Design a protein around this ligand. Structure first.
Ligand code: HEM
Ligand code: D0L
Length: 454
């Protein structure tokens, strides 16, 4: 029974000022490097414990002992994502109902139906880059975000955001990005109810109204027309939960659509951006991935079955998720009193944060080459210890979008490596911007066409 380390305190504010930074996850990573596999973090009125070791996280991932907690970040996102899957408690009726209704829409099988839509957007990205002039470069996270938002819009509700036709984001997106910024900024405020934050609160309410009005009109317009497109919205209007026999209500459908647009904007785009970053920093790895793409993608348009055969590209994406998991944490609560790792007693209700980037750096799992980009680490999942690799979270509350994200990312990265050579022309220094998620900021490359027709 050990006493837990705790980082430096600021009197009555305890640890809270440590998060007064534009890079709080990267600050918590540096604290974990100093304090080790577990530390206590206190703010006025709340305590959590940050876990970094596979030794403790494998226990935290025991669903008989721990359930998903809404972190303060998720509670603030819930003001616009409601009781959508991502911001619902496991015990709320609408979690299991929506989970049962939506699981078939997110399976490996369902991906065959979404593939043609994903290819539509992927072809738009390839044509954009084919059409750049000799003097020009690519804004990587900008273009990956254009792609991943457009893909979920088209597969979500058959809506074209037409992001490759715009410098300025669609108005829904300007509102969603500003709401996500206010949710994440609200975290840092020692003094939240101050009047210096009164404009922020007024803007948040306008942004919520914007997201609701576009999404509610999309739903209303679809029911009115009665058309049956094979998108998530059609599945949610016609689907019944096998348990309750009930469908989702129109308000819950709107929370699910907002949730899916947040995920498509924030997470998959981060993964593609980090994957291209590691490939241009690791030319031998880029070469082996480009060789797979050339051998497998033998048709102008990739097929679903071809994407399934891009195994090495799959390993590249997992190794990018290992070093920079774009969704960097999740939160758990103890269902009952229990002891963590035979050292740290917890009471019913005590909270934990899993710091995924640190878990993925555990040298007892990955060895001394832990900072190196080596996709071959992922050749044999049976050779990886339990709960060592958690970029999609844990158990019944794991990412429902995992198959969707990995299909889209494998397809697009495979087409990028087929069609272009890449140059890191600025010798880019990694700068990680934090929103809901992690993304390279300012990452730019030059892409020289291999002139292979679409
Ligand atoms: C690389 C891409 C992505 C990553 C890394 C990612 C990561 C995660 C993680 C870590 C969680 C667990 C969060 C927690 O325990 O608090 C999660 C949940 C979720 N993700 Fe994703 N996600 C990705 C893409 C997507 C996509 C494309 C969708 C939907 C189109 C999506 C929808 C969701 C939903 C709905 C949940 C909540 C599931 C539930 O609790 O029932 N994600 N994601
Ligand atoms: C993909 C979603 C990732 C969300 C990860 C959370 C991302 N947080 C952003 C800051 C770091 C990280 C986190 O540890 N937050 C906790 C801690 C906390 C609670 C209350 C006030 C301030 C901070 C929380 O939100 O409860």
């Amino acid at each position: 029974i050990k006493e837990m380390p705790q980082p430096k305190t600021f009197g009555e504010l305890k640890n809270l000022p440590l998060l007064n930074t534009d890079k709080p996850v990267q600050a918590l990573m540096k604290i974990a490097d100093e304090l080790g596999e577990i530390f206590k973090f206190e703010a006025p009125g709340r305590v959590t414990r940050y876990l970094s070791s596979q030794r403790l996280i494998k226990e935290a991932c025991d669903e008989s002992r721990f359930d998903k907690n809404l972190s303060q970040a998720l509670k603030f996102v819930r003001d616009f994502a409601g009781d959508g899957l991502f911001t619902s408690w496991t015990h709320e009726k609408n979690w299991k109902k929506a989970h049962n209704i939506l699981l078939p829409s997110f399976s490996q099988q369902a991906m065959k139906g979404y593939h043609a839509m994903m290819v539509d957007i992927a072809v738009q990205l390839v044509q954009k880059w084919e059409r750049l002039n000799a003097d020009e470069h690519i804004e990587v996270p900008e273009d990956m975000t254009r792609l991943t938002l457009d893909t979920i819009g088209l597969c979500g509700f058959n809506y074209r955001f037409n992001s490759f036709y715009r410098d300025q984001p669609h108005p829904f997106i300007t509102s969603m990005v500003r709401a996500l910024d206010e949710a994440m900024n609200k975290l840092q405020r020692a003094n939240p109810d101050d009047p210096a934050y009164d404009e922020n609160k007024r803007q948040f309410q306008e942004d919520i109204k914007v997201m609701n009005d576009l999404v509610d009109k999309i739903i209303a317009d679809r029911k009115a027309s009665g058309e049956q497109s094979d998108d998530l919205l059609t599945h949610m209007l016609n689907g019944k939960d096998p348990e309750t026999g009930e469908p989702l209500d129109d308000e819950n459908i709107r929370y699910q659509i907002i949730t899916f647009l947040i995920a498509g904007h924030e997470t998959t785009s981060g993964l593609l951006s980090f994957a291209l970053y590691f490939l241009v920093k690791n030319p031998h790895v880029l070469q082996k991935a480009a060789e797979e793409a050339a051998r497998v993608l033998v048709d102008p348009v990739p097929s679903y079955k071809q994407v399934k055969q891009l195994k090495y590209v799959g390993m590249v994406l997992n190794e990018a998720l290992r070093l920079w998991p774009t969704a960097p944490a999740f939160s758990l609560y103890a269902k009952e009193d229990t002891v963590l790792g035979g050292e740290y007693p917890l009471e019913k209700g005590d909270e934990l944060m899993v710091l995924i980037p640190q878990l993925h750096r555990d040298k007892t799992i990955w060895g001394d080459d832990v900072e190196e980009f080596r996709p071959e680490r992922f050749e044999n999942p049976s050779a990886i210890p339990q709960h060592a690799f958690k970029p999609f979270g844990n158990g019944q509350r794991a990412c429902i979008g995992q198959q969707f994200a990995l299909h889209e990312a494998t397809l697009v990265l495979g087409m990028m490596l087929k069609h272009f050579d890449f140059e890191d022309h600025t010798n880019y220094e990694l700068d990680i911007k934090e929103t809901l998620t992690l993304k390279p900021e300012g990452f730019v490359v030059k892409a020289k066409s291999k002139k292979i027709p679409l």
